[PDB]
């Protein structure tokens, strides 16, 4: 059963095993069961850890339900794949990726006075091809002041760095004037409309190029896994795979009583139903209850 | 879909575009008589303007019945399509069995016939492993778990470098 | 036997979801007993 904080996370979720846990919970509440009071407890560090591990139970069956657009031509399979992961972010409680990674910046650098310590605590989230181009330009503005460039904004020594880092950001290809004019806004709704149409033209060309770089790495991983496997004789392949299949079954049979190992071996019985339901009618496929 | 849709019997398709199925509607004032002809069968019913609006009240919401998952079957479909590009170049292999006769055995150098019989045994090694298509499903499970861990990002499932770089300039080139 | 369901057949199979649940069922009740008992 679910712990009533999982089932609040699975309401806007749309995978199968989470909706049938919701639907049997809503069928219990139709038969007069009391909805248990959700906890007004679990302080700021424990609340961010439950949100970390309940979002990952919405993301994990959702990622396995998104077909990769491997070996497709065009942007719309890559835009479908990116839109399904956007919607998986919203179903799991994430915001927009722009609003969720900039929250990661301002959280990791809450205590930063100099921008060299910004550029070292946001190292995991910024590309090293871009972290280096902001560190080389930093040491030139460090050469003009011969004092550490501050994370102040009011400082004029930062204002000449922010005009040099804007020259770096346009060199990568990303419009730093359009990005800044979106998250700041404007007064009228007509001049803010044209900059949102120009941010979302960058943003869609941004997240497509992250999805397409993810597809081009799965395509390159699968093509090197296959070409290594096609160089084996077929007798080696069948026993390398039967050794890997049997070792991975035994790890789920060593684990007794665990919920994951009970569900692992129950899905092995559901794959063998799929192979057996196809053998009865192969022009029809698997037989669904209809 | 959304909850309320607003299409049906207004700017509708009035005729089919292929020859495999023949479509005719009878645009009356209230209702419409459809004439559908597909193969040997014909159907001629009557659909109101408010009969198509109740169609999108209950949604179909199709979903895929996969053997393991939709992710895995999309990787295995790519390994099956990659294994075709290798099979198509084993289709272009020269028929070495046309040189198996003893008028090629005895004209040939005895070491260039060991190599010819080894290059024929090699083709059966390559061909019997490229048609081992039951091994492509376990190869797709070597791609899945490393991909699925990159999607368990603490930032976002759809985050990447280009977005997180472009959202650094909003963080850096704003004040503190 | 035959003809399972549709909502039984829409489940992704070898997802984690239950290692993530088994970890959070042994990390969240084990860390509430860390902040309730914490002095440096």
């Amino acid at each position: 059963a679910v712990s009533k904080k999982e089932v609040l996370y699975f309401l806007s979720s749309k995978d199968a095993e989470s909706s049938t846990a919701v639907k049997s919970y809503l069928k219990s509440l139709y038969a007069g069961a009391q909805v248990e009071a959700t906890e007004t407890d679990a302080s700021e560090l424990i609340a961010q850890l439950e949100k970390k591990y309940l979002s990952a139970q919405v993301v994990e069956p959702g990622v396995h339900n998104i077909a990769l657009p491997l070996g497709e031509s065009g942007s719309a399979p890559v835009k479908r794949y990116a839109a399904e992961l956007f919607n998986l972010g919203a179903q799991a409680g994430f915001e927009c990726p722009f609003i969720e990674v900039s929250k990661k910046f301002g959280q990791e650098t809450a205590t930063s006075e100099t921008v060299k310590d910004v550029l070292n605590k946001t190292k995991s989230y910024v590309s090293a091809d871009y972290n280096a181009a902001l560190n080389e330009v930093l040491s030139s503005v460090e050469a003009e002041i011969n004092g550490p460039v501050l994370f102040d904004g009011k400082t004029e020594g930062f204002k000449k760095f922010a005009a040099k880092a804007k020259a770096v950001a346009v060199s990568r290809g990303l419009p730093a004037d359009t990005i800044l004019a979106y998250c700041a806004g404007s007064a009228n709704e007509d001049a803010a409309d044209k900059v949102s149409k120009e941010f979302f033209t960058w943003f869609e060309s941004a997240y497509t190029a992250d999805a397409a770089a993810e597809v081009k790495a799965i395509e390159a991983e699968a093509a090197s896994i296959l070409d290594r496997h096609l160089a084996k004789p077929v007798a080696q392949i069948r026993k390398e795979q039967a050794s890997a299949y049997a070792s991975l079954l035994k790890r789920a049979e060593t684990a007794k009583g665990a919920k994951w190992a009970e569900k692992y071996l129950e899905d092995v019985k559901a794959v063998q139903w799929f192979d057996a339901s196809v053998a009865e009618a192969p022009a029809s496929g698997p037989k669904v209850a209809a | 879909l959304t909850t309320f849709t607003f299409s049906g019997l207004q700017d509708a398709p009035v005729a089919a575009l292929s020859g495999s199925i023949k479509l005719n509607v009878a645009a009356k004032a209230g209702k419409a008589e459809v004439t559908v002809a597909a193969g040997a069968a014909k159907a001629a019913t009557q659909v109101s303007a408010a009969a198509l609006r109740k169609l999108s009240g209950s949604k179909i919401s199709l979903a895929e019945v996969a053997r393991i998952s939709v992710l895995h079957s999309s990787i295995q479909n790519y390994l099956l399509s990659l294994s075709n590009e290798r099979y198509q170049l084993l289709s272009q292999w020269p028929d070495f069995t046309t040189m198996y006769g003893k008028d090629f055995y005895y004209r040939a150098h005895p070491e260039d016939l060991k190599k010819f019989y080894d290059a024929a045994d090699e083709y059966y090694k390559l061909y019997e492993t490229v048609t081992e298509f039951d091994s492509l499903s376990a190869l797709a499970s070597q791609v899945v778990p490393n991909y699925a861990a990159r999607r368990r990002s603490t930032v976002h499932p759809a985050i990447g470098s280009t977005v997180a770089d472009g959202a650094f300039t909003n963080f850096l080139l704003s004040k503190q | 036997a035959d003809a399972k369901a549709l909502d039984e057949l829409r489940k992704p199979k070898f997802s984690s979801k239950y290692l993530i649940q088994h970890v959070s069922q042994k990390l969240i009740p084990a860390v509430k007993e860390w902040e309730k008992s914490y002095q440096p």
């Binding site: 995991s124 989230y125 090197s224 | 990002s153 | -």
Partner: peptide, 30 residues
Amino acid sequence: YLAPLRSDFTEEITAPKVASASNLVNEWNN
């Protein structure tokens, strides 16, 4: 066909490590 179950998160936002082209099309053309 079954995979090892992993429960670990990705903290870095990196490039996805495009692997190198194997020479199997060039080896089999040889």
